[PDB]
Amino acid sequence: TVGSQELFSVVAFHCPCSPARNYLYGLAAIGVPALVLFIIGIILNNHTWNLVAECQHRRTKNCSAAPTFLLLSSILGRAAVAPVTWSVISLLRGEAYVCALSEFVDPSSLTAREEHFPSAHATEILARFPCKENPDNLSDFREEVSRRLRYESQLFGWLLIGVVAILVFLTKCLKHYCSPLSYRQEAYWAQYRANEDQLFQRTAEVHSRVLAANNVRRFFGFVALNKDDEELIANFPVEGTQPRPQWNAITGVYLYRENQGLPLYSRLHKWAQGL
Amino acid sequence: TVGSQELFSVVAFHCPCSPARNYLYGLAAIGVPALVLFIIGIILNNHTWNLVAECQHRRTKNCSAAPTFLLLSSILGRAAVAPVTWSVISLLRGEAYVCALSEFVDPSSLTAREEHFPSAHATEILARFPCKENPDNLSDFREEVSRRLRYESQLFGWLLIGVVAILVFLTKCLKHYCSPLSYRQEAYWAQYRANEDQLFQRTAEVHSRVLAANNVRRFFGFVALNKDDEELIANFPVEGTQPRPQWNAITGVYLYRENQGLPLYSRLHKWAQGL
Amino acid sequence: TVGSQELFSVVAFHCPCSPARNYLYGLAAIGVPALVLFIIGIILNNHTWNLVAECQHRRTKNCSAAPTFLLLSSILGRAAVAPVTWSVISLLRGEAYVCALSEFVDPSSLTAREEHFPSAHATEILARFPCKENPDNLSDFREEVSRRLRYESQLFGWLLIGVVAILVFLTKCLKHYCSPLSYRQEAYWAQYRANEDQLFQRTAEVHSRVLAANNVRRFFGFVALNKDDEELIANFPVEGTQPRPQWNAITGVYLYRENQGLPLYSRLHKWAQGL
Amino acid sequence: TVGSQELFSVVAFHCPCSPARNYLYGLAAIGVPALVLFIIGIILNNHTWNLVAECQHRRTKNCSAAPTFLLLSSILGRAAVAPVTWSVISLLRGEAYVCALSEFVDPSSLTAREEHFPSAHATEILARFPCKENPDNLSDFREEVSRRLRYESQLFGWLLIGVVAILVFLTKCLKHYCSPLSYRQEAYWAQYRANEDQLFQRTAEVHSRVLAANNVRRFFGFVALNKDDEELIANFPVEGTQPRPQWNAITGVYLYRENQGLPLYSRLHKWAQGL
Amino acid sequence: TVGSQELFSVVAFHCPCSPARNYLYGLAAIGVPALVLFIIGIILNNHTWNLVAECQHRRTKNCSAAPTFLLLSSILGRAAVAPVTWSVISLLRGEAYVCALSEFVDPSSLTAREEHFPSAHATEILARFPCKENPDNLSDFREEVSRRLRYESQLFGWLLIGVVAILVFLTKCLKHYCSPLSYRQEAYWAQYRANEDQLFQRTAEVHSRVLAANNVRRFFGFVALNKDDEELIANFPVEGTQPRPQWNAITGVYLYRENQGLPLYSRLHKWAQGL
Amino acid sequence: TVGSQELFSVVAFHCPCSPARNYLYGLAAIGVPALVLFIIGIILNNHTWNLVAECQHRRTKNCSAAPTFLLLSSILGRAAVAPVTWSVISLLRGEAYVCALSEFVDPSSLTAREEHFPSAHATEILARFPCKENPDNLSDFREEVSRRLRYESQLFGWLLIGVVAILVFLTKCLKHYCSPLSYRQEAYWAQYRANEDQLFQRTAEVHSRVLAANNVRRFFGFVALNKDDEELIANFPVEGTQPRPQWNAITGVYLYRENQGLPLYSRLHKWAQGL
Amino acid sequence: TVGSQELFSVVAFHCPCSPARNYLYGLAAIGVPALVLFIIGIILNNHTWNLVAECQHRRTKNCSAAPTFLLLSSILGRAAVAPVTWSVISLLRGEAYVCALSEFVDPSSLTAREEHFPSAHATEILARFPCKENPDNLSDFREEVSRRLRYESQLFGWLLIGVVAILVFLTKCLKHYCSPLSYRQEAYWAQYRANEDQLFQRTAEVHSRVLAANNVRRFFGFVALNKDDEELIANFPVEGTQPRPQWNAITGVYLYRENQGLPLYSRLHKWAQGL
Fold it and tell me: How many CB contacts within 8 angstroms connect chain E with chain F?
């Protein structure tokens, strides 16, 4: 609240009342926060790196661009919410759009009201309306064009949130309509991927810690463990880790080939059933 | 409250006092929030995806469009409450409707009051009434037309909530009147569907976790479990998962065929009794 | 309190000071909230669906319309409190009734006070009294007619709450006077219906859960239970559920036939004693 | 908050309204805090000292400058966030940039407004605009140039945060695209480095303490231990510490050579597998 | 906060507006608090006394001035932070520097503004500017020279904090670049010195207490112990303390000679391995 | 705070604006609180009485005046902090010094400003400046001389705290440079003196209490003990106390003679090793 | 605080502005509270009664007046702090001294200022200055003489606290310089006197209670005890109390004769060793 206002004050809009310049600032303050939120949505997502590790060394578009497209749909479903929550919250606030298109209004009524105002004065005085710099001779006209431009901004924001709503609906019906499986089995697959990822993180931490303890014990002569780590060395000994081709056989896109009719829900499962 | 007001301020109405434009903004601010709430009501509902998975790969309208209609009635019963709670709360507030139909009033009394006001000035000055931009010569007239339009809005909101009340009553009497069973057995069926869905989610998480643990143990040499997961591996071993036609035999619309007189309340129950 | 005022503000009355229109708004704001509260009182009641399931597939008015009438008396006793608590709280507040019948007053004293006011001006200026739009020449007259109309509203509200009081008294003496049994046995019957309904809901949840667990165990190979559900599978096994004619023999109106003199308090009890 | 304001007051900007001087102060107050935050980001990072210990006594650029480049990428990923969070928070506040480029504006409109103002007076009066020292004859002109310069500052800040966003995205895709391994194995490697570093710190403290206790016991005749340290002497005796070439074999850049196909995740692991 | 302000009020600056005197006061209030903080940084550091005990009775610069230089680098790293945090917090506040160099400004513009002001009046009126004692004829000129001098102070403070940042960076790269060992072994050495110092303080307190108890018991006939001290006498008896040449063999600079390849991390360790 | 202000109000300065008198009051209010704090620093210190008991009956300056000088250095290190914290807090407040030397200023500018003011009036009006009793003709002159005298006071306070800082640094380097031992052994000696003094106080209380209990039991026939004192009589019986020459052999200056090379850290230790 | 102010208000000073009378009131309000605090310091001290019981019936100044002088030094050390904390807190407040010596000032400047004021008017108007009863013709003169008299009071208070500080220092060096013993043995003696006095009070209460219980049991037939008193009768029986010459052999001044070289720290110890 307090720190939220103290951070929202610097990011707040300040319309530069200048023609052919304010619309560039409006485009920046709309798009560039939406762009950085979009790119950190791709950054925060981990399955993007699964995709790039799938296509870099394998160089395999052999299946199709469609499993990559469904993966990318999950990417943008995690990611692209952040640009579109910013674009609509700017558009319905309308400040960026009035600062954008204040210098594009038909000045005919303004020229009739301002005793034949010339386009050199008209475009510049149109740009000065979002700073409320209109005089008393044009304050009502500035309020009228400000309300019409606020209308256009809010209508564009509502149309954009409507079309992204129908877009997310259509990609859900596409994902369930181009599905190679049920929706109960897709839920089982989602729970399998969550269980495998959580179990794999936990066992990677445990196996890495046991390997580190064996190396340290080889160095010093002993190790410094809590009782939990003493139980870890007691329970799960290691002779050696896993080779890098065997590690490469695990990563990649989540396949759904079915070995001998029985399904394989991930590449680790494919690798385990392959042995 | 505080954050509720801070979010309600941006979504709040701002009537663009301009003719043949303000009614489009009123239609947008009524319908498009109602449309996005309606479509996310279809999104949040999971049985929609049961319906689309029933009609996509089976392509079966073989039973009727009436079980799909009862399913869709449940869909809209979960979903369509959100557009209609928005349309009435906008209509009884009346701001969207006065901003809509301020530019449609018979201007005859306005022309008589405003010394033969022409329709070029009359429609534009009618559009400026929701901004309270009427002068002292027409402030009382603006209050009169504002109260009459607020009357029309509130009457339409009350009629719409009345007709959706009689509509939900008629679809309940339709559902109980076109019911192939009792209402105690329908309650037993609802409790069966809740128990099967909850038990199936829990056993899907458990079986997925045990399969993931077997794959990980095949990879590393062990697994990292809490004591609960150690009990899970101790209690429920798995040799193999279930094939995809057997998974497809589970999904679909909730049938109520009765094998040999004895009822089958869901497709899993049909599949279990079939063996 | 705060949210209560924030919700009561939108539902609050706004009298459209316009003749032959304000009484329609008063009728709407009285009746339509009373109508929707009445219809959701029928919706929230579950025994309505018992009645419609009794008369739909059996099509049996064979006993009489009088057990249906006593059932409907219980329906309206649960239900119709909500329209009548709304109609009196509107009537004693009087705003809906003054907005209704402000445009129906005898304007003879108003014509004498307003220097022969014509009925074109008189009816419209009568409609403008609930907005307190009377001038200083008629402010005292507006206060007089407002107090007389508030009298008429409050007297009608008190008469309506009195007549619904005598109505609920007469239907209680009818129910105890057309009773086929004592009032201690009617209390025993009410406690029997409560015990049967609660026990039947609990055993329906339990039996549905055990059937769902048997189907799931047939599918996966095991089930995911808490210790309570493990006790449930341990205690109450199921071979098969109950057929639909046997389920139809349970539903219906609460009979009080007496098999061989010994009473049967519900159709489940009739069905159990019949075996 | 309170102490935060008391510390932010001294570091706050104070634009010296003087030509060819204020831009040096703006460059200082932007860059030098960014420079000291950058250099303490290199200081706080410990892997910088791993790099300098790798290149000092070994003098080995024998592998490539690319593992040093990936290490330095991790260095700047930990470090360089602090200069760029300062440069943008200064740039979007705009005070440093208006104090920088107030003395560079085209004074043609200022000379036309100020009755042929000469460049000796014009540059100095341009420098006095960030102190709001313009008179009433040029207050509106000062507001116009201040808003245009605030536009230029905020646009440069948004462009810089956008380009560092695309830069961090490109270096992540470079790191995953020039990766000699998977991304699951890179996660296993990160967890191995964390486990080895934590276990090595704990066992270094323990082994150092046991060596210190043996030296002290050699001096006095006994030692002063808590019960934990008594357990430490009871569990891990030491005959001698490790020689300095063996200590040098541990430090250095994190290699990923693979001895006989089996991977070696750190130089301690390389040293342990080498024996 | 409250006591902090009550202590900061007396140490606060009071510029004596007098020529060739105020700069001496500014130099005092900058340097002398920085000098006393520097000298108590040398006082609070204990390794300074290790250095002076190393060079006093041994009189040995036999190794080099470079281990003394690295020790002194640690001394100033603990110590010299306190003068430089004072000099910059005075310089960025700027009061000491404006009070210093207010009596050194070029008075040519002041002589032109003050109707040929002579240097006898000009230097004295320049000294009176930090008390804001300029009249209305020179208040704007005083504000201009005050802002320029505040610029010079803040620029000097930023340059000084930048150069001490690069200085601490260069001495860290010197310490790691002139290191006779790794950085992991330097961390092991730091943990060894911490463990030896803590264990030696604890065992010095324990051994001193046991010796005192033996002397007191020799005097009175018994001792007054808590149960902890009773355990101390029970566990660690003493026959005699350690001789002064053996005590001198412990103190001195932290050597890193390596006896027979195996390292010796401190002089106590050298003394223990020597036996 | 509140009581602190209520006590600081009476000790607060009240400058008697009178020539050749106010400087005596300033000297009193500076020195006499510093003198009483210095003498109670000698009073609160207990080792002063060790020194006077060493030199009174022994009359022995036989060792040197240098162990007495090191003891006195410890005396003043405990003691003399209290006068010097008072002198600087008075000097930097400056009130005592302006009240001192207000009657010593060169009155030449005052005589030129006050229309040839005579030294009979000039010295008395100089003394009245610390009461702010200067008129409007000399208020600015009084402010100038007050600021110059406040400068002189604060500069003297800073120089005095600087010279006592270098003094305490030089006596620490003297104590470590004229040390007959290490600094680790000096720390062991300090811990020995603390342990011997604490153990000797506790055993003096215990032995005195047991002797008192034996005398009382000889008088009454029994004693009144708590359980702790019952344990004290149970554990440490006494036949007789220690003779006065044996008590005199304990007191005196802390010697560091070394009997047969082995050190003796106090006279009790010398006495115990002597037997 | 509140009650402290309510008690300090009545004891507060009220200077009777009357010549040759106000100084008697100042002498009373200084001395008589100091006198009553001094005499209750002698009253609260118990060793005064030891002294008077030593000199009354024995009538023995046989040792010297010097042990009585050291005892009296302890008496005044406990006692005389209370008059001297009152005299200085009155003197530094200065009200008693200005009320004392306002009627003693040289009236020559007052006679020159008051148009040859006669000594009949001058002494009386000098006495009225502490009530601030001087007119505007002498308000500044009253402030001058009030500040000079406040100077004289505060200087006398500081000189008195300084001389009592040097006095308490000299009597401590006298007590340690005329000591017949060490200062460790004096501390042992102080702890012996504290232990004997505390043990003697406790055993006097216990022995008196047991004697009272035996007398009561001789009267009634039993006694009423708590469990603690039951333990007291169980543990310490009494046959008879101690005779009055044996009681007189205990009281008296604390001797330090040494029987056969071994010391005797109190007369009870002398009496016990004598048997």
Answer: 160
Q: Residues G259, G265, G270, G274: is their CA dihedral positive or negative?
A: negative
Interfacial D residues in 218-237 facing E (CB < 8 Å) = 218-225
N- to C-terminal Cα separation, chain G: 57
- Name every chain F residue with its beta carbon within 8 A of the beta carbon of E8: none
Cα separation, D22 vs E220, whole angstroms: 80
Q: How far is CA E77 from the centre of its chain?
A: 7
* Helix ranges restricted to H, chain A: 2-8, 22-44, 47-56, 66-79, 81-93, 95-101, 108-113, 119-127, 139-177, 184-219, 227-235, 244-248, 267-274
What does the block give as tokens for A53? 């590790």
Q: Which residues contact F110 (CB under 8 A, 6 or more apart)?
A: F117, F122, F125, F126, F138, F141
The label of the residue with tokens 């046959």 reads: G239
Which stretches within F105-255 are classed as H helix? 108-113, 119-127, 139-177, 184-219, 227-235, 244-248
Provide the residue type at B83 as one letter.
P
**CA of A155, closest CA in chain B: separation in Å?**
7
Distance CA E254, CA E194 (A): 12
Spatial separation of the C-alpha atoms in residues B63 and C255, rounded to whole Å? 37
Q: Which two tokens stand for residue E110?
A: 């002041």
Q: Which residue has the tokens 């005292």?
A: C140
Helix (H, G, I), strand (E, B) or coil at F263: strand
Cβ–Cβ contact F8 with G under 8 A: no
Q: Which of F26, F33, F25, F27 lies closest to F7, judged by CA?
A: F33
State whether E182 and D53 contact (CB < 8 Å): yes
This structure's resolution (Å) is 3.5
Cα distance between residue C87 and residue C94, in whole Å: 10
Helices (H), E57-107: 66-79, 81-93, 95-101
Residue E162, both tokens? 């930048």
Which residues from chain E sit within 8 angstroms of residue F109, using beta carbons? none
Number of C-alpha atoms within 13 angstroms, CB side, residue C137?
9
Contact call for residues G138 and G114 (beta carbons, < 8 A): yes
Distances from the Cα of C1 to the Cαs of B85, C6, C9, D242, E208, in angstroms? Answer: 21, 8, 12, 75, 73
Any G CB within 8 A of F45 CB:
no
Q: Is A210 in contact with A236 (CB distance < 8 Å)?
A: yes
CA C164 to chain centre: 14
| DSSP secondary structure, G223-236, as one string | ----HHHHHHHHH-
Counting runs of H as helices and runs of E as strands, what totals does chain C give?
A: 13, 2
* Residue A228 token pair: 């939990």
Question: Which helix (DSSP H) or strand (DSSP E) does residue A259 occupy?
Answer: strand A258-259
Determine how many CB atoms are found less than 10 A away from the CB of residue C118: 10
Determine the residue among F98, F183, F236, F264 to mutate to test chain E binding: the one whose Cβ has the most chain E Cβ atoms within 10 Å.
F183
Among F95, F84, F87, F85, CA closest to F23? F95
Amino acid at F117: F
Q: E39, F165: Cβ pair inside 8 Å?
A: yes
Of D158, D182, D202, the CB nearest to A247: D182
C66-79 vs C47-56: helix crossing angle, rounded to 10? 150
- Using CB atoms within 10 A of its CB, is residue G233 exposed (0-12), middle (13-18) or buried (19+)? middle
E158 shares contact with chain D (CB less than 8 Å): yes
- Answer whether F25's CB lies under 8 Å from G154's CB: yes
- For residue E20, give the chain F residue with the closest CA: F148
Residue B124, Cβ neighbours under 10 Å: how many? 15
Q: Does B209 touch chain C (CB under 8 A)?
A: no
Report chain A residues whose CB lies below 8 A from the CB of D236.
Answer: 221-222
How far is it, in rounded angstroms, from Cα A100 to Cα A27? 7
Determine which helix (DSSP H) or strand (DSSP E) holds A64, and give its type and residue range: none
